[PDB]
A and B are shown apart, each in its own frame.
Chain A
Amino acid sequence: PHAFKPGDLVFAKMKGYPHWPARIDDIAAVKPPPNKYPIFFFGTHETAFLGPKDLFPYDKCKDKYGKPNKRKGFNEGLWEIQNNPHASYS
């Protein structure tokens, strides 16, 4: 396995939220601190900076975290990561 690179699909964990469908974004923009990545969250289309310890590869982990939730924006995010993970959501 290799380091995360822009375009990689993941589940991303933030304090007080379930593991969320997301992608490593291109920094093309506020630049992350050392060894953290810019993360675009599907569904809510928000951004944050997370280190690998909160980043879970999509296809390994989707059986675990890819099940629908009742949380606002989550199911929308499953749709996005499954149907057009590399589109512009701007």
Chain B
Amino acid sequence: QDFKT
């Protein structure tokens, strides 16, 4: 998971 800011 690459969390969107």
Question: Looking across the interface, which residue of chain B has its beta carbon closest to that of A47?
Answer: B1
Tell whether, in the assembled complex, residue B1 and residue A44 are in contact, meaning their CB atoms are under 8 Å apart: no
Cα distance, A41 to B4, chains bound together (Å): 9
Q: How many A-B pairs fall under 8 Å by CB? A: 15
The size of the chain A interface, using a CB distance under 8 A, is 9
SS class, residues of chain A in contact with chain B: loop
Interface string of A24-53 (1 = CB under 8 A from B): 000001100000000001001111100000
Q: How far is the CA of A6 from the CA of B2 in the complex (A)?
A: 18
Other CB < 8 Å A-B pairs besides A29-B1, A41-B4, A47-B3, 12 of them? A14-B4, A30-B1, A44-B4, A45-B2, A46-B2, A46-B3, A46-B4, A47-B1, A47-B2, A47-B4, A48-B3, A48-B4
A-B contact pairs, 15 of them (CB 8 A): A14-B4, A29-B1, A30-B1, A41-B4, A44-B4, A45-B2, A46-B2, A46-B3, A46-B4, A47-B1, A47-B2, A47-B3, A47-B4, A48-B3, A48-B4
